[PDB]
């Protein structure tokens, strides 16, 4: 019903996006599409 | 025929302006 | 008393499932070398 | 209203305002003709588009001979 | 009072004045037709259908009269160039005159129906209220449409009792009005087959008669009557506008792409004929053929009809115009006088070179000469200092075969460049720019103007369709929504089915 | 330049030297201005759609509102009930103050960025 | 035969006059350059 | 009001929701990853790999130039890589 | 080929694990 | 006479009929099962 | 109470996401158009149709990915999967540009679906259908730019490709080739879009700064009840303010909100017409009077002549790479160039 | 003549501004 | 400048015709009340 | 253009004849 506090779910989904987005930006400087 | 090019506008406005005057006056007479 | 499988359920997973699949494919892509 | 000779002749043609067949009437038969006409426009379109290519049908000015 | 944008709604419940208005509209449209033709007759030059056809002269309705068989003037000329003909009463002038007489007669009938609006015919015999049985009217009018459509195809287009229609060869060299026989096979759907136009009007005419008979005898189902508000004349306006914009999109496309009913001698070439080098292929085909059988270069090219060469020239490409470049194409590049001949370029090493032709997208294009393999061998440079390929360096010359400069060769670089700047437009013509005081800038043809107007009107009539369709289906709330709409009806959950009060929870 | 074509000259030169189309602050500006036009049309259509019937068909519905009347002239719940169903319920405002603040904020902020 | 019952007065308030005149004059200002060309 | 579906806020804080989805979400992520790492995505969709845009001593685009032979043209280019 | 099961297997097991964890409540 | 593109035409015509008919079969079934109360 | 009415019942049930009869057309088409765009931009190249990379898989980012248009050699082929070009081969379909027509066509029918949805929901809820009417402007823009414009040109190739940078190139193309900024129909579109955004911001700001004090807190949002009868801000004070600041002000809330519908809807309709002309190359490219003078008078210069030089640079410098099927070879010496640059 | 035309229109717009502001229909309350 | 000579009549009628129309409607509105 | 102008004015006058006769203010015996 409400076992997992909502703020927790939001914090953890939060870094979830930060991680995937930061991966995509590291990828702009490495490998395909880096110009190198 | 090598006529005057401002002839067209002079004729057109000569008709248009006074005629619109009269139309304006007639229509507002009718609606009172 | 809530139903689990609804129209709503279907609309969500119709977007959510392939979104995560695509996220995985795109993350893999960051490691491709030329 | 004013009666005229031509009016009295045409009269029955404008006399059934509001009359309907009951229920769905010929709606299923209409739907069939609609379906046939869609397919038929499809063909006509795809012929013009060169997406449907047919034997002896050359979609070019060179079909004037 | 009524707002200005609603003055014409006073006709919604007045069938007689509705007819009066429709008569006046029809009077005006026919009057226009007659006026437009007279203006075009007074400005048309019939003296050269080869290099000054009607479509170079800004002619708009002349080609539609010609399309269905009106080809001559009481003055003695015909648009095919034949002279001393006697068109009978159905000349361009007589057609124009009939539309003006028709206009005047429609005008008078409009007056009568406007005054005598209150005809018993328009009253519902049971309730005494004005009413129009729109389902039966549809059947009557559809039956009539089908009779006319069938007769048009069975008598006019076949020549059974009528002139036929304009047909031509694939290169628009030899067109004329001929009777056309039906094409009943699948090539009748080929837009470029004139026999299909005949078969269409026969078969569709017969279907229209049958459908018309159905719609006169069979009443509409109650479900459908209710769904489409068939007691409301505005539902007819909504669907009628939709059919009209459908028809408008179709005629714009076939004008732009070309079909048997938009022949190039009445409307001009299409842009696709330039994109695909359609006439240039055919011209080369004939020069090759003339050469294989041993004719000289001068002979092979002199055999090229000027009319065909004039199609292979971008000034007749309808996609070279501009919105506010007004008037006839002649007003731009001029009145074409003669084909100057086919320009052949060669460099100092005798190799033949080919001017890269201007694509329709480009207002301006550089002058680039290639060899048969596509390798650049000469150009006119912009920056001169590091020029590799100048006409001066490469020794480029121009020689003419056929036409007015046949057998002439030019070697002075400025002259040679001058022709190379024209060779990007295709074949080279001599124009009269003085007579019309032509400004030198390409205009579009009637094919272009017609397509633009009709594509635009179509899109706009789609909005009309949406507006009047909405008005029909939402008549009850036109002036506003119910001031007693209760909040339980628009809030979620109260009713199982949205809006249906019988599905309360 | 203070002129119509002068303006376009400025834009073409600016794109060549700054690749402004590829700048995020210009992209936000387009979003502020496209969205501003969007929400202008939305809000105008939703309010116009839920005008309470106060007039006949022969008069402009605009005469259903008198300057300084205290009662609202449209039904905001009917507008919410339409819009929440067009998308889904919680993607619709029923608080007029939040809505009109949204209307102010979106183009203002987008145009700040593009400036 | 009775007079036609479907007739209605027509109206244009002052504000609509000002709105329409602005529309026409600005439209003329915009297209005039193109008419003169 | 409400239309009867279970509220989202109630679902994503529920233990059962996360029991199922801590499997489905990474499983999908991994599946997507594998689609790329195996090279299957290249083959399904026809996308050139970094080594196969050009033949070695070539700088011409293998540009499709025919409408109805276009299928064969692309295959002709791919064969100029084997 | 072989890569297609490799890709599909996480999805299929994801679908199994959800099926088995929800099946009772879906019956109701 | 029966060309490849005419065969493809029927392929697409059939496939689309499958999609519409299946879709409607499904919707009619669900609408029968889960009715509204009046 | 046959099957049709039973189905109507189900489609129209009040649920979290309304379906309707319009849903049958809307939801498949919207999902497929959306899915095609996400699929193409993630996995599909434009190498064979354009000589461009265009997906995440190939190294592109969100700004440079696109579903690009098919090759100019497809003409206006519908490019059906089962059609004569791809012949049911999915892979070839992708390489030949088939996803473009897929997205364009399914998108077109989704837009129809969505506008029918606005009609359906409005009828059931009991409101006037002005939101549907307003949406006619997005539709006109979409069909005129994505469908009508390429249909007038040689092929779909010259339509916009579905991508951020690809749309940027579309903008610049229209400047260099059509001189689109000079087009009075675009200018009316500009005034409508900027006019709308202004109206949007000025109407929201005005309401928020003519609020009545209806609660006690510094957050004024809480002091509104959506069922209250009273206006939540003073039209009277708003009218005074704007009358004294600007000269004129709205006095009728109905006109005001109709005007907000009118301005951007009309603006978009106008630009669509201009694009229809550009389908035919019916451009507002030049002013003849300017050119006659300039040719004869080499000291006569205007911002008009300065912008055509720019257009001529755009054309010559982007044409070879942007229209690869034309095999344009422009040697260095023919490229137009000012001094030094 | 084109200069006269352009300035004539512009000047009609400024005069209209004067009337729209100082000679508007006054807004009256309820 | 060598401008199109019908531009003047085009522009004059373009202004005059619809303006006159509006003025006719406005004045007869005022003589009603 | 001048032919069209002469004929247009002549046409308008013939139209005015029609209205002046058939749509005159009816003289009525007061
Ligand atoms: C608003 C509501 C929104 C509703 C949403 C609708 C969503 C779906 C709409 C369906 C889209 C239909 C597009 C059909 C493609 C098209 O047209 O396809 C084009 C084909 C014609 O094909 C083209 O034809 C051209 C000319 O060909 C001719 O010329 C050549 C050289 O001269 C050769 O002779 C050749 O053999 C000969 O055919 C070129 O060959 C092109 O490459 C080839 O594509 O016509 C055809 O299929 C059909 C042509 C006639 C039908 C006209 C259709 C109406 C729409 C067109 C309006 C555009 C108006 C243009 C103004 C700008
Ligand atoms: C379907 C309609 C149609 C078409 C396609 C043509 C096509 C043609 N005509 Mg014809 N003509 C028509 C109707 C048509 N005409 C009508 C109705 C008349 C009577 C007025 C004429 C009178 C006529 C004459 C007298 C002449 C032609 C000529 C010509 C040729 C050149 C046209 C040209 O330069 O246009 C250029 C057109 C424009 C620049 C028009 C642009 C439209 C403006 C900008 C729109 C205004 C915008 C609007 C205010 C939108 C804002 C609204 C918003 C605020 C709400 C061409 C073949 C000429 C020719 O060569 O004859 C031999 C010629 O001299 N026509
Ligand atoms: C066969 C086509 C047709 C017919 C018979 C009607 C009929 C009607 N329309 Mg519809 N309409 C149509 C097409 C049509 N419309 C199209 C294509 C559109 C989209 C542009 C609309 C958009 C539309 C709107 C938005 C509205 C109507 C309204 C109305 C009603 C009142 C109209 C009125 O008094 O205008 C009076 C108009 C004038 C006095 C002057 C208008 C002048 C325009 C700007 C330019 C002049 C054009 C020129 C003279 C000739 C036409 C050129 C070309 C089309 C041939 C009436 C039933 C009104 C309504 O619903 O009221 C209930 C309304 O609000 N119509
Ligand atoms: C409402 C949903 C909808 C709509 C409008 C469209 C519309 C379209 N699709 Mg999409 N599509 C959909 C759902 C939809 N699709 C779904 C659900 C899928 C996934 C399965 C797809 C997958 C898809 C692909 C993969 C492709 C399309 C394509 C197309 C286009 C061509 C369709 C065509 O030629 O139809 C032809 C068929 C019909 C019009 C059906 C007619 C049915 C009538 C009513 C009955 C006919 C009788 C029947 C044949 C009798 C059977 C005989 C038997 C007993 C032997 C068109 C824009 C193509 C495209 O975009 O081109 C690039 C394409 O390649 N669609
Ligand atoms: C002051 C700057 C300015 C302004 C305000 C405008 C304003 C406009 N321009 Mg111009 N433009 C300018 C400068 C400017 N322009 C310059 C300098 C150039 C260089 C020449 C151009 C070149 C240009 C081109 C080439 C075109 C325009 C177009 C337009 C119009 C776009 C209308 C629109 O919203 O389409 C947005 C698109 C739509 C409304 C279509 C339907 C959208 C549907 C509803 C999308 C639904 C999305 C769905 C939910 C899925 C989303 C998922 C996804 C996001 C992940 C608008 C009138 C276009 C136009 O006039 O076409 C009519 C056009 O084609 N402009
Ligand atoms: C209000 C709107 C205007 C009303 C309608 C227009 C009516 C105009 C009628 C006058 C026509 C003007 C002549 C035709 C056009 C023409 O070409 O003009 C054009 C001429 C100008 O002339 C132009 O000049 C050009 C260089 O400047 C070139 O030379 C052109 O060739 C030449 O046409 O217009 C004028 O000269 C107008 C002068 C007006 C003053 C006239 C002085 C006489 C006044 C005494 C009249 C008393 C009569 C009382 C009767 C009781
Ligand atoms: C190759 C072809 C590929 C494409 C093929 C497409 C085929 C068409 C498939 C269409 C499927 C959409 C229908 C979804 C219905 C649903 O999922 O069931 C949910 C319903 C049952 O749940 C119920 O849900 C109800 C609420 S509601 O209807 O879901 O809103 C509730 O009333 C009830 O109590 C509850 O048990
Ligand atoms: C031979 C052919 C004859 C052609 C005749 C000419 C056509 C007739 C005239 C048409 C012009 C009508 C103008 C009506 C103008 C006018 O009446 O507007 C006000 C008017 C108010 O409508 P209401 O419903 O309040 O009705 C009040 C009534 O008195 C109206 O009759 O709104 C409507 O007309 C709706 C359309 C508004 C249109 C909005 C445009 C105004 C915006 C101004 C922006 C200017 C641009 C500057 C910014 C860059
Ligand atoms: C910045 C732009 C957004 C404006 C801000 C929003 C202001 C309006 C919010 C007010 C409501 C406030 C109540 C608090 C709650 C709140 O504001 O909203 C959050 C809302 C919470 O609702 P639940 O019922 O889950 O929770 C109960 C709570 O509301 C109690 O506080 O959840 C969502 O709406 C989830 C939406 C995700 C949906 C996933 C996708 C669904 C598929 C859609 C397919 C598309 C539709 C079809 C297209 C045609
Ligand atoms: C009475 C009578 C008569 C007479 C008649 C007449 C003489 C007629 C005429 C008529 C006419 C003579 C008509 C005409 C008309 C015209 C019109 C109707 C026009 C229209 C136009 C328009 C509408 C246009 C528009 C536009 C513009 C302006 C711009 C551009 C765009 C557009 C196109 C939109 C007679 C003796 C026979 C007989 C007895 C009786
Ligand atoms: C085409 C096709 C098809 C279909 C398909 C589909 C339907 C697809 C889908 C797909 C999809 C459905 C996909 C999805 C994806 C997604 C994604 C990929 C997403 C992403 C996202 C992101 C990345 C975000 C993030 C962020 C940021 C960055 C910032 C802010 C925040 C946020 C969170 C928003 C078929 C089979 C029929 C066949 C034909 C072809
Ligand atoms: C309007 C309803 C039509 C919507 C669905 C139509 C499309 C349905 C998907 C059809 C895809 C299957 C056929 C594609 C492969 C053709 C087989 C082949 O030619 O090799
Ligand atoms: Fe508001």
Count of structural domains, chain K:
1
Ligand closest in space to the Cα of K271: 5
Domain assignment present for residue K137? The answer is yes
CA nearest neighbour of K70 among K54, K90, K86, K48: K48
Contact L/E (≥3 CB pairs under 8 Å) = no
What lines the ligand 9 site, CB under 6 Å? C 11-12; F 87-88, 90, 93; H 7-9; K 17
| 3-class DSSP state of E77 | strand
What is the spatial distance between Cα E336 and Cα E309, in angstroms, rounded to a whole number?
Answer: 12
CA E325 to chain centre: 19
**Ligand whose nearest atom lies closest to the CA of F38:** 5
Same domain assignment for residues E215 and E264: yes
For residue E97, the CA-to-ligand 10 centroid distance in Å is: 13
E321 burial level (CB within 10 Å; 0-12, 13-18, 19+): buried
Task: Give how many domains chain H has, as a whole number.
Answer: 1
d(CA K281, CA K301): 26
Q: K247 touching G, CB under 8 A?
A: no
Residues 6+ apart with CB under 8 A from E101: none
Identify the CATH number of the domain defined by range A1-36.
6.10.250.2070
- List Cβ<8 Å contacts ≥24 apart for F22-27: F22/K63, F22/K165, F22/K168, F24/F113, F25/F113, F25/F114, F26/F114
- Partners of D55 on chain J (C-beta within 8 Å) are 1, 3
Structure tokens at K180: 């689109």
Q: Which two tokens stand for residue E19?
A: 């007819």
CA distances from J10 to E188, K90, K261 (A): 21, 18, 46
- 3-class DSSP assignment, residue K52: strand
CA distance B16 to chain N (A): 11
Structure-block tokens of residue K231: 């206006």
CB contact under 8 A, G32 and L2: yes
Report CA-CA distances (Å) from M28 to B26, E2, E99, K180, L27. 9, 13, 37, 43, 21
**C-alpha to C-alpha distance for E481 and C21, rounded to whole angstroms:** 47
Residue E429 lies in a domain: yes
* Burial class of residue E299 (count of CB atoms within 10 Å of its CB; 0-12, 13-18, 19+): middle
Ligand 3 atom with the shortest distance to the CA of E12: 57
In a domain, K48, yes or no: yes
> L5: CA distance to ligand 6 center in Å?
17
- Copy the structure tokens of residue K295: 């040719």
* Method of structure determination: X-ray
Question: Is K310 near chain E, with CB under 8 Å?
Answer: no
Q: Is K76 annotated as a binding residue?
A: no
d(CA E455, CA E461): 10
Q: Are K84 and D46 a contacting pair at CB < 8 A?
A: no
Q: Whose CA is nearest to atom 27 of ligand 11?
A: A21
* Distance between F100 CA and the closest CA of chain E, angstroms: 22
DSSP code, position F28: H
- Tokens at K167, concatenated: 């749309």
Tokens describing residue E35: 């006026």
Query: Which residue is closest in CA terms to ligand 8's atom 29?
Result: G12
Helix (H/G/I), strand (E/B), else coil: F20: helix
- Structure-token pair, residue K176: 């260099």
d(CA E70, CA E87): 8
- Check: CB of residue E291 under 8 Å from CB of residue E304: no
> How many residues make up chain J in this entry?
38
In this structure, what is the dihedral angle of CA atoms E204, E210, E216, E217, given to the nearest 10 degrees? -160
For ligand 3, say whether the CB of E460 is within 6 Å of any of its atoms. yes
**CA–CA distance, K313 with E283 (Å, rounded to integer):** 35
> What whole-number distance in Å separates Cα of residue E497 and Cα of residue N17?
65
Using the CB atoms, write b or e for E84-116: b if 16+ within 10 Å.
Answer: eeebeeebbbebbeebbebbeebbebbeebbee
CATH of D1-51, one of 3.40.190.10, 3.40.120.10, 3.40.630.30, 1.20.5.880: 1.20.5.880
CB contact under 8 A, A32 and K59: yes
Residue H1 lies in a domain: no
Q: Does the Cβ of C19 fall within 6 Å of ligand 11? A: yes
* Residue N22: both structure tokens together: 């058939």
Q: What is the dihedral of CA K97, K103, K104, K105, to 10 degrees?
A: 110
DSSP string, K252-294: -HHHHHHHHHHHHHHHHHHHHHHHHHHHTT-B----HHHHHHH
Q: Are residues E437 and E419 in the same domain?
A: yes
Please report residues of G whose CB lies closer than 8 A to that of E116.
Answer: 1
Q: Do A32 and C32 touch (CB under 8 A)?
A: yes
Q: What are the start-end ranges of the H helices in chain K?
A: 3-11, 20-43, 47-50, 90-95, 98-125, 130-142, 149-152, 164-178, 184-208, 235-246, 253-279, 288-296, 303-322
Alpha-helical (H) ranges within E171-316 are: 194-217, 222-227, 233-257, 264-267, 271-275, 278-292, 297-302, 306-311
Q: Is residue F74 one of the residues assigned to a domain?
A: yes
Residue H33 is encoded by which pair of tokens? 């990853």
Nearest CA in chain H to A8: H13
Q: Is K28 in the pocket of ligand 11 (CB under 6 A)?
A: no
User: What DSSP element (H or E) covers E430?
Assistant: strand E428-432
Residue E25 Cα, ligand 3 centroid: separation in angstroms? 13
Ligand 12 atom closest to the Cα of residue J7 is: 19
Nearest to E44 by CA among E32, E58, E29: E58
Give the domain range for residue H78: 6-82
Q: Ligand 8 pocket, K108 CB below 6 A?
A: no
> How many separate domains does chain F show?
1
Mutate to test the interface with H, among A2, A8, A19, A32 (most CBs of H within 10 A): A2
SS3 assignment, position H43: helix
Q: Is there an atom of ligand 5 within 6 Å of K145 CB?
A: yes
Give me the number of domains chain E comprises. Answer: 2
Q: Do M7 and L9 touch (CB under 8 A)?
A: no
- Helix (H) or strand (E) segment spanning residue F112: helix F96-114
Q: Tell me: do E436 and E462 sit in the same domain.
A: no
Residue A32 to residues K44, K75, L28: CA-CA distances in angstroms?
Answer: 15, 33, 68
Clarify whether residues E147 and E194 are in a common domain: yes
Shortest-distance Cα residue to atom 36 of ligand 1? D60
H4 neighbourhood in chain C, CB within 8 Å: 2-3
Question: Which tokens go with D50?
Answer: 């060169």
Give the one of E3, E10, E324 whose C-beta lies nearest to G7's C-beta.
Answer: E10
Q: Is the CB of J23 under 6 A from ligand 7?
A: yes
Instruction: For helices C7-29 and K20-43, give the axis angle rounded to 10 degrees.
Output: 10
Judge contact between E444 and E320, C-beta under 8 A.
yes
Is C14 a known ligand-binding residue? no
Which CATH number goes with the domain that contains F39? 1.20.85.10
Element of type H or E holding E339: strand E335-346
Count the Cβ atoms, other than its own, within 10 Å of residue L6: 16
Whose alpha carbon is nearest atom 44 of ligand 4? D35
Q: Are residues E215 and E249 both part of a single domain?
A: yes
The secondary element (H helix, E strand) that includes residue L18 is: helix L2-22
- Tokens of residue N2, six digits: 């001048």
Residue K290 contacts M, CB cutoff 8 Å: yes
Q: Report the DSSP beta bridge partners of residue E497.
A: K13
Helix (H, G, I), strand (E, B) or coil at J19: helix
Pairing of strands K162-163, E176-178: unpaired
Say if residues E213 and E139 touch (Cβ distance below 8 Å): yes
Q: Do residues K335 and E382 make contact, with C-beta atoms less than 8 angstroms apart?
A: yes
Q: With beta carbons under 8 A apart, name residues in chain C contacting I25.
A: 4
Domain that holds residue K61: 23-341
User: K82 exposed, middle or buried (CB, 10 Å; 0-12, 13-18, 19+)?
Assistant: buried
3-state secondary structure E358-378: CCCCCCCCCCEEECCCCCEEE
Within 13 Å and on the Cβ side, how many CA atoms surround E475? 12
From the CA of M23, how many Å to the nearest CA of chain L? 13
How many whole angstroms separate alpha carbon E20 and alpha carbon E315?
47
Domain assignment present for residue F5? The answer is no
For ligand 7, is residue J30 a contact (CB within 6 Å)? Answer: yes
Is E253 part of a structural domain of the chain? yes
In a domain, H52, yes or no: yes
Residues of N in Cβ contact (< 8 Å) with B7: 2
CATH number for the domain spanning E338: value is 3.10.680.10
Distance CA F67, CA K250 (A): 10
Q: What is the CATH number of the domain that holds H13?
A: 1.20.5.860
Taking the CA of residue K110 and the nearest CA in chain C, the distance in Å comes to 16
For every residue of E379-395, DSSP letters joined together read E--SS-TT-SS-HHHHT
Partners of E322 in the beta sheet? K283
E251 & E325 share domain = no
Q: Are residues E142 and E13 in the same domain?
A: yes
**Alpha carbon separation from F36 to F101, K164, K199, K200, K201 (Å, rounded):** 13, 20, 8, 6, 7
M11 with G9: Cβ contact below 8 A: no
For residue E484, what are the contacts with CB-CB under 8 A and spacing of at least 6? none
Do C and G share at least 3 CB pairs under 8 Å?
no
Angle at K138 between CA K134 and CA K139, to 5 degrees: 100
Question: Ligand 9 atom 10: the closest Cα is on which residue?
Answer: F90
Chain E environment of G6 (Cβ under 8 Å): 10-11, 13-14, 17
**Could you give the residue ranges of the DSSP H alpha helices within E45-130?**
62-67, 92-115
Torsion of CA E445, E446, E452, E457, to 10 degrees: 170
Q: How far apart are CA F75 and CA F49, in angstroms?
A: 9
């Amino acid at each position: 019903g409400g076992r997992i506090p909502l703020w927790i779910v939001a914090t953890v989904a939060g870094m979830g996006v930060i991680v995937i987005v930061g991966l995509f930006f590291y990828g702009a400087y490495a490998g395909l599409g880096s110009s190198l | 025929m090598e006529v005057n090019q401002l002839g067209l506008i002079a004729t057109a406005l000569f008709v248009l302006v006074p005629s619109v005057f009269l139309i304006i006056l007639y229509v507002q007479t009718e609606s009172q | 008393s809530y139903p689990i499988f609804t129209v709503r359920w279907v609309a969500v997973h119709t977007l959510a499932v392939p979104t995560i699949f695509f996220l995985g494919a795109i993350a893999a892509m960051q490691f491709i070398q030329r | 209203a004013r009666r005229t000779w031509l009016g009295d002749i045409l009269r029955p043609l404008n006399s059934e305002y509001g009359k309907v067949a009951p229920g769905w009437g010929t709606t299923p038969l209409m739907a069939v003709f609609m379906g046939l006409f869609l397919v038929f426009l499809l063909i006509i379109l795809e012929i013009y588009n060169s997406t449907l290519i047919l034997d002896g049908v050359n979609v070019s000015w060179k079909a004037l001979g | 009072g009524l707002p200005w944008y609603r003055v014409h709604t006073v006709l919604i419940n007045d069938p007689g004045r509705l007819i009066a208005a429709h008569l006046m509209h029809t009077a005006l449209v026919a009057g226009w037709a007659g006026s437009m033709a007279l203006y075009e007759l007074a400005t048309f030059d019939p003296s050269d259908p080869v290099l000054n056809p009607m479509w170079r002269q800004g002619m708009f309705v002349l080609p539609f009269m010609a399309r269905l068989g009106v080809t001559g003037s009481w003055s003695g000329w015909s648009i095919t160039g034949e002279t001393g003909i006697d068109p009978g009463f159905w000349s361009f002038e007589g057609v124009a005159l009939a539309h003006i007489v028709l206009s005047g007669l429609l005008f008078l009938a409009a007056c009568w129906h406007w005054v005598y609006w209150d005809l018993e015919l328009f009253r519902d015999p049971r309730t005494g209220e004005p009413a129009l049985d729109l389902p039966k009217m549809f059947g009557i009018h559809l039956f009539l449409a089908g009779l006319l459509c069938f007769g048009f195809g069975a008598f006019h287009l076949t020549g059974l009792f009528g002139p036929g229609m304009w047909v031509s060869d694939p290169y628009g060299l030899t067109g004329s009005v001929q009777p056309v026989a039906p094409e009943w096979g699948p090539d009748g759907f080929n837009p470029y087959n004139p026999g299909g136009v005949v078969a269409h009007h026969i078969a569709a005419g017969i279907v229209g008669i049958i459908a018309g008979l159905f719609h006169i005898l069979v009443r509409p189902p109650q479900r459908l009557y209710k769904a489409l508000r068939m007691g409301n004349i505005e539902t007819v306006l909504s669907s009628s506008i939709a059919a009209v914009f459908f028809a408008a999109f179709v005629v714009a496309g076939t004008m732009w792409y070309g079909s048997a009913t938009t022949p190039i001698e009445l409307f001009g070439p299409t842009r696709y004929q330039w994109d695909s080098s359609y006439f240039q292929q055919e011209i080369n085909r004939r020069v090759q053929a003339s050469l294989a059988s041993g004719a000289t270069l001068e002979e092979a090219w002199s055999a090229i009809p000027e009319k065909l060469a004039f199609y292979d020239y971008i000034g007749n490409n309808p996609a070279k115009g501009g919105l506010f470049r007004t008037g006839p194409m002649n007003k731009g590049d001029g009145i074409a006088q003669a084909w100057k001949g086919h320009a052949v370029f060669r460099n100092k090493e005798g190799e033949e070179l080919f001017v890269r032709r201007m694509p329709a997208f480009f207002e301006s294009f550089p002058v680039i000469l290639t060899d048969k393999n596509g390798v650049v061998k000469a150009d006119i440079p912009f920056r001169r200092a590091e020029s590799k390929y100048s006409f001066e360096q490469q020794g480029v010359t121009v020689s003419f075969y056929g036409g007015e400069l046949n057998g002439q060769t030019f070697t002075d670089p400025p002259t040679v460049k001058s022709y190379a700047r024209k060779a990007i437009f295709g074949e080279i013509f001599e124009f009269d720019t003085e007579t019309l005081n032509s400004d030198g800038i390409f205009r579009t043809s009637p094919r272009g103007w017609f397509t633009f107007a009709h594509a635009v009107f179509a899109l706009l009539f789609f909005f009309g369709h949406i507006w009047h369709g909405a008005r029909t289906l939402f008549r009850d709330v036109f002036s506003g929504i119910d001031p007693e709409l209760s909040p339980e009806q628009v809030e979620w959950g109260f009713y199982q089915k949205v809006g249906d009060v019988t599905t309360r929870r | 330049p203070l002129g119509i074509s002068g303006t376009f000259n400025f834009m073409i030169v600016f794109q060549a030297e700054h690749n402004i189309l590829m700048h995020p602050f210009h992209q936000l500006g387009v979003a502020g201005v496209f969205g501003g036009a969007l929400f202008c049309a939305m809000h105008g259509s939703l309010v116009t759609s839920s005008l309470i019937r106060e007039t006949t068909e022969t008069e402009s519905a605009n005469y259903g509102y008198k300057f300084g009347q205290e009662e609202e002239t449209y039904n905001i719940v009917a507008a919410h009930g339409y819009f929440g169903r067009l998308i889904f319920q919680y993607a619709s405002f029923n608080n007029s103050r939040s809505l009109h603040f949204f209307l102010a904020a979106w183009p203002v902020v987008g145009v700040w960025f593009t400036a | 035969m009775e007079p036609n019952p479907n007739r209605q007065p027509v109206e244009l308030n002052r504000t609509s006059l000002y709105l329409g005149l602005l529309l026409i004059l600005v439209l003329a200002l915009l297209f005039s350059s193109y008419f003169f060309n | 009001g409400t239309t009867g579906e279970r509220p989202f806020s109630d679902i994503i804080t529920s233990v059962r929701y996360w029991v199922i989805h801590s499997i489905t979400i990474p499983a999908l992520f991994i599946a997507g990853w594998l689609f790329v790492s195996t090279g299957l995505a290249y083959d399904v969709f026809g996308t050139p790999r970094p080594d196969s845009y050009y033949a070695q001593e070539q700088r011409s685009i293998p540009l499709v130039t025919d409408r109805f032979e276009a299928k064969q043209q692309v295959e002709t280019f791919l064969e100029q890589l084997k | 080929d072989w890569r297609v099961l490799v890709v599909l297997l996480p999805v299929l097991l994801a679908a199994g694990w959800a099926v088995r964890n929800i099946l009772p409540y879906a019956v109701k | 006479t029966i060309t490849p593109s005419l065969k493809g035409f029927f392929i697409g015509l059939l496939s689309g009929a499958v999609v519409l008919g299946l879709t409607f079969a499904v919707l009619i079934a669900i609408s029968q099962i889960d009715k509204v109360q009046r | 109470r046959g099957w049709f009415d039973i189905l109507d019942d189900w489609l129209k049930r009040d649920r979290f996401v309304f379906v309707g009869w319009s849903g049958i057309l809307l939801f498949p088409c919207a999902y497929l158009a959306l899915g095609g765009w996400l699929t193409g931009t993630t996995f599909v190249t434009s190498w064979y149709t354009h000589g461009l990379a265009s997906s995440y898989l190939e190294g592109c980012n969100f700004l440079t990915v696109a579903v690009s248009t098919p090759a100019n050699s497809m003409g206006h082929s519908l490019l059906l999967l089962w059609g004569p070009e791809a012949q049911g081969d999915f892979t070839r379909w992708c390489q030949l540009g088939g996803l473009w027509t897929f997205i364009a066509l399914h998108g077109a029918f989704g837009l129809i679906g969505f506008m029918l949805r606005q009609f359906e929901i409005a009828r059931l809820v009991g409101v006037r259908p002005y939101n549907a009417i307003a949406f006619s402007a997005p539709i006109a823009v979409f069909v005129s730019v994505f469908l009508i414009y390429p249909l007038g040109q040689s092929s779909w190739f010259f339509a916009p490709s579905f991508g951020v940078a690809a749309i940027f190139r579309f903008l610049l193309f229209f400047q260099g080739f059509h001189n689109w900024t000079l087009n009075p129909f675009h200018m009316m579109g500009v005034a409508g879009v900027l006019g709308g955004a202004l109206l949007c911001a000025i109407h929201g700001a005005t309401v928020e700064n003519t609020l009545f004090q209806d609660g006690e807190g510094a957050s004024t949002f809480r002091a509104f009840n959506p069922t209250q009868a009273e206006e939540t801000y003073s039209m009277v004070t708003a009218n005074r303010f704007w009358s004294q600041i600007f000269g004129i002000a709205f006095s009728n809330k109905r006109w005001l909100h109709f005007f907000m519908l009118f301005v951007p809807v009309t603006g978009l309709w106008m630009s669509a017409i201009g694009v229809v002309g550009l389908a035919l190359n019916l451009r507002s490219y030049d002013f003849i009077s300017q050119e006659i003078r300039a040719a004869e008078d080499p000291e006569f210069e205007t911002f008009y002549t300065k912008n055509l030089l720019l257009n001529e640079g755009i054309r010559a410098w982007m044409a070879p790479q942007d229209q690869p099927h034309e095999n344009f070879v422009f040697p260095e010496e023919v490229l137009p160039r000012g001094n030094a640059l | 003549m084109e200069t006269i035309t352009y300035v004539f229109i512009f000047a009609c717009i400024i005069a209209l501004f004067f009337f729209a502001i100082f000679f508007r229909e006054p807004p009256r309350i309820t």
